[PDB]
Write a protein that binds this ligand. Structure first.
Ligand SMILES: [Cl-]
Ligand SMILES: [Cl-]
Ligand SMILES: [Cl-]
Ligand SMILES: [Pb+2]
Ligand SMILES: [Pb+2]
Ligand SMILES: [Zn+2]
Ligand SMILES: [Zn+2]
Ligand SMILES: [Zn+2]
Lengths: 36, 36, 36
């Protein structure tokens, strides 16, 4: 329903933000290997 | 419209879930290099 | 509100598309290390 859609969108926004940070952490490790 | 928004949100949820799994696969490869 | 939800969903769709491309760029670098 409407309220369930609002909550689903907020949960997806937060899941994507968390994935963006996980990828930034992966990138830091990859850059340490690339420049090692 | 409403129905199109519902479907767009479900498609985005699935795209993000697929990206999370792709990143986990990248992380496994990176960890093999980090610990090689 | 409704219009704010529509815009939030479009902004999230674009953020995810940008993250997918960033991960593809990370994967290219990782594959160069894996096959180096
Ligand atoms: Cl670390
Ligand atoms: Cl593998
Ligand atoms: Cl490059
Ligand atoms: Pb990633
Ligand atoms: Pb996402
Ligand atoms: Zn680099
Ligand atoms: Zn490690
Ligand atoms: Zn490879």
């Amino acid at each position: 329903e409407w309220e369930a859609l609002e909550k689903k969108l907020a949960a997806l926004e937060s899941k994507c933000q968390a994935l963006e940070k996980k990828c930034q952490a992966l990138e830091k490790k990859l850059e340490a290997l690339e420049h090692g």
